């Protein structure tokens, strides 16, 4: 609680100089980046429990992707033949408006689409970068991960 | 036990085997004395026909099998080892040969499943291929390459690059590499009553009348020509129809021999008469 | 009336005399491109060989004109602080400004971008996308991996569409025509195709970058990895001809199946390409800006020089590097033109066959000297001394 507490809270210091108004940029940035990580440390048993369970080799990218490893479920992408995929993926991380295009192909999908594979629309909802507020939603993921999970 | 294809080195100085034993043999004749030198094993099923590419490339040799995949040995020094495989045929792969020297270091491979890869060599140990899906219905047996034919510049001529290939529908299609890169199919030839065996793309004697034959289940050996360049007229004429089937055929380099291999475990030879009808010169063995 | 050719290059040094340089070769190349023009529309089968001639020289004017305007017009700009935390985008930006050799490539690039063909666009396109698989069902999963992930699903039929397309969206993007590829994959309905589109462009900030501030944030911040992956996926059988030419391209790296009918102009350009994506990453990798996650997959680190890709090129396309005029390009483009200039001159004492050689090399003369003092004071007059001969045979000596 405390640490948490601190990541969030406590005052972040940049010991680079630099121009100025970045730097509230680029200390938010180091704040994500600490908070983001210390999520991960301890919904890593969790995520890696459930992965160990996995009998797919697609679901568990979608796992990595909730571990915040990007570049392990890009291999395992590719590993695994799901090449286009893999590209994709690398995209994570990516704040880039690629999320439109995405939503888009997602849209078209659920409007036709008679057959798409479960968990890579997940992938897909995710690199929209809405994913539980949107249509297509990881909303009922709620009850399989933990609420610090999503 | 028994042997499939066997071909002779360029220069003729070694010689090529394999039999169903998953064993690609490399013996050496000098004087008319056979030598092996190595054994390169390395198939999951019987090795089917076998080839050796053009001195110009150093000292290769590749070898196509039942087990899908098909194997290249290269050679450094005594160093016969193999610099790369190829695995991309679901079903076995009936037959393999090279592109004339001139278009480079081509390799056409035919499968069983009714597919045609074109391993084409690059700067290093890369190889892109090329492949041509459901190119035959049930498979494909034979595969042979057109005559390097060539079209104000010091340029290196952009050839046809055409090659045929008879298979298990009956049917002889040959090829031609599109401009654009791809192979399609420039037309078929249905003159075959079952599976065509063999199809061999005679040389040519500089000569324009190219000319292709074909051996198939049905004992029939057709030596379908072409009557000028550029007029897509492939006539097939019949050599003759044994009770049994053939299965291979090859041709002498000057005379445009035939060597009919089928039948009766015997092996004849055929020369076109001054006639036009072919003839039995002799029977081997 | 043809023949009156002669007067429109001299034509526009009347005015240079009265006005300005730079226009002179922009001139040359607007006037050859009229030439190629009239034989070209309607004319005896010989004229055509004569056309193309004149097309080449419009291209060569326009390469001249492009690569001595930037390094002569150079004018000492102020140089870019870069800082660690600034992104991968905003240091290939300072690496294009800074390295002169590097961006000269890039001019050349565009340049021979500009002169590329495309076919006309896909005409009746499907409504949708692998709609004879989907009607043909069978196809688990839409997803473009679905084919990589598992055999023989996809109809024949959509295997050939999949062919035009991914063979106009190449053509496309050797053109250039990046946005216009981007505009094709989107309305084609390739929507994942069109991702990988977007997977070119580097991540800047405008926040964080303050240098080219723009409004959103752009680009993906793993480029390595996207690079990688979409090498890795070049590589993977089992896709189109045409569509692993292109990652080809996007990783940097070389293709076969399609570079059989590559010329030297596609050639030159593909082989620059590679030059150029290796040099980027390895002034990235020195910056530190990479990642070691990243570095998935080995590549080819080694970048040669631009002397060595032409002579590469050269072996492998000897006719159109035999060519009179495209040893020019060429040469342009390593900077030693008034070597050849000099070199061309001693051949006069077979140029003589060529008629637009000897009236090429003068004309550029001419120019460079304008433009720079250069060349050598000898050459130039055996040039013209040469070039008036040919007037008066001509009998145009009114312009002498």
Not at chain 1, 99 to 122: K, N, P
Not at chain 3, 243 to 270: F, H, M
């Amino acid at each position: 609680t405390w640490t948490l507490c601190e990541a969030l809270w406590g005052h972040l210091k940049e010991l680079d100089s630099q121009l100025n108004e970045p730097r509230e940029y680029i200390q938010i940035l180091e704040r994500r980046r600490a908070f983001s990580r210390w999520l991960s440390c301890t919904a890593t048993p969790q995520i890696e429990e459930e992965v160990s369970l996995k009998n797919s080799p697609v679901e568990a990218v979608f796992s990595y992707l909730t571990g915040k490893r990007i570049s392990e479920a890009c291999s395992l992408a590719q590993q695994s033949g799901d090449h286009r995929l893999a590209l994709l993926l690398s995209q994570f991380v990516g704040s880039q408006s690629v999320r439109e295009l995405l939503t888009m192909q997602l849209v078209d999908w659920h409007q036709l689409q008679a057959f798409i594979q479960d968990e890579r629309l997940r992938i897909f909802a995710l690199l929209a970068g809405k994913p539980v507020q949107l249509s297509e939603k990881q909303i009922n993921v709620c009850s399989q991960l933990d609420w610090k999970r999503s | 036990d028994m042997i499939h294809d066997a071909q002779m080195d360029y220069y003729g100085t070694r010689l090529a085997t394999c039999s169903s034993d998953r064993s690609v043999k490399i013996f050496d004749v000098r004087n008319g004395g056979q030598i092996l030198i190595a054994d390169l094993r390395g198939h999951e099923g019987p090795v089917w026909q076998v080839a050796w590419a053009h001195p110009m490339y150093g000292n290769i040799l590749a070898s196509c099998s039942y087990d899908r995949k098909v194997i290249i040995w290269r050679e450094e020094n005594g160093t016969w080892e193999k610099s790369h495989e190829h695995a991309g045929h679901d079903s076995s792969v009936n037959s393999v040969c090279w592109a004339p020297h001139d278009y480079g270091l081509i390799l056409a491979c035919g499968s069983s499943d009714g597919a045609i890869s074109l391993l084409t060599y690059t700067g290093e140990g890369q190889w892109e291929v090329k492949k041509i899906n459901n190119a035959h219905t049930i498979g494909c047996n034979a595969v042979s390459w057109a005559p390097a034919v060539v079209p104000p510049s010091g340029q290196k001529p952009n050839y046809i690059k055409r090659f045929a290939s008879g298979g298990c529908d009956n049917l002889i299609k040959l090829w031609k590499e599109e401009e654009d890169g791809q192979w399609k199919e420039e037309q078929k030839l249905e003159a075959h009553s079952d599976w065509v065996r063999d199809v061999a793309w005679a040389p040519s004697i500089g000569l324009p009348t190219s000319t292709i034959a074909s051996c198939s289940q049905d004992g029939r050996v057709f030596i379908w020509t072409c009557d000028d360049a550029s007029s897509n007229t492939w006539s097939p004429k019949l050599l003759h129809k044994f009770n049994d089937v053939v299965w291979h055929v090859s041709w002498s380099i000057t005379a445009n021999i035939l060597a009919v291999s089928g039948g009766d475990n015997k092996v004849t030879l055929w020369k076109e008469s001054v006639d036009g009808q072919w003839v039995c010169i002799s029977d081997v063995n | 009336a043809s023949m009156s050719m002669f007067s429109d290059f001299l034509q526009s040094f009347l005015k240079h005399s009265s006005s300005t340089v730079f226009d002179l070769v922009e001139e040359y190349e607007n006037i050859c491109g009229s030439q190629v023009n009239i034989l070209s529309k309607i004319k005896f089968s010989k004229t055509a060989s004569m056309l193309w001639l004149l097309q080449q020289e419009m291209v060569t004017w326009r390469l001249l004109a492009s690569l001595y305007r930037d390094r002569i017009q150079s004018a000492e700009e102020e140089s870019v602080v870069t800082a660690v935390n600034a992104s991968e985008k905003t240091v290939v930006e300072a690496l294009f400004q800074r390295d002169s050799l590097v961006r000269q490539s890039q001019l050349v690039v565009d340049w021979l971008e500009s002169i590329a063909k495309d076919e006309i666009g896909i005409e009746y396109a499907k409504s949708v996308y692998w709609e004879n698989t989907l009607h043909t069902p069978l196809v688990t999963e839409l997803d473009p991996d679905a084919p990589i992930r598992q055999k023989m699903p996809l109809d024949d039929l959509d295997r050939e569409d999949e062919v035009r397309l991914l063979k106009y969206l190449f053509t496309l993007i050797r053109a250039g025509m990046t946005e216009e590829a981007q505009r094709l994959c989107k309305r084609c309905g390739q929507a994942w195709r069109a991702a990988t589109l977007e997977g070119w462009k580097l991540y800047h900030d405008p926040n964080v970058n303050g240098g080219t501030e723009l409004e959103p944030v752009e680009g993906n911040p793993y480029r390595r990895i996207w690079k990688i992956s979409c090498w890795r996926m070049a590589e993977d059988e089992l896709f189109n001809r045409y569509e692993r030419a292109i990652y080809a391209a996007l990783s940097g790296n070389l293709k076969q199946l399609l570079p059989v009918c590559d010329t030297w102009e596609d050639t030159v350009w593909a082989y620059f390409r590679v030059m150029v994506d290796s040099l980027v990453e390895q002034e990235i990798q020195t910056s530190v800006a990479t990642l070691d996650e990243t570095e998935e997959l080995p590549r080819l680190g080694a970048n040669w020089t631009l002397e060595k890709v032409f002579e590469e090129l050269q072996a492998t396309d000897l006719e159109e590097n035999q060519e009179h005029y495209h040893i020019v390009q060429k040469f342009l483009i390593l900077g030693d033109i008034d070597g050849l200039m000099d070199e061309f001159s001693k051949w006069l004492s077979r140029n003589n066959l060529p008629g637009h050689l000897l009236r090429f090399m003068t004309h550029l003369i001419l120019f460079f000297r304008t433009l720079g003092l250069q060349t050598k004071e000898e050459v130039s007059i055996e040039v013209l001394k040469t070039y008036i001969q040919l007037l008066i045979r001509e009998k145009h000596t009114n312009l002498i």
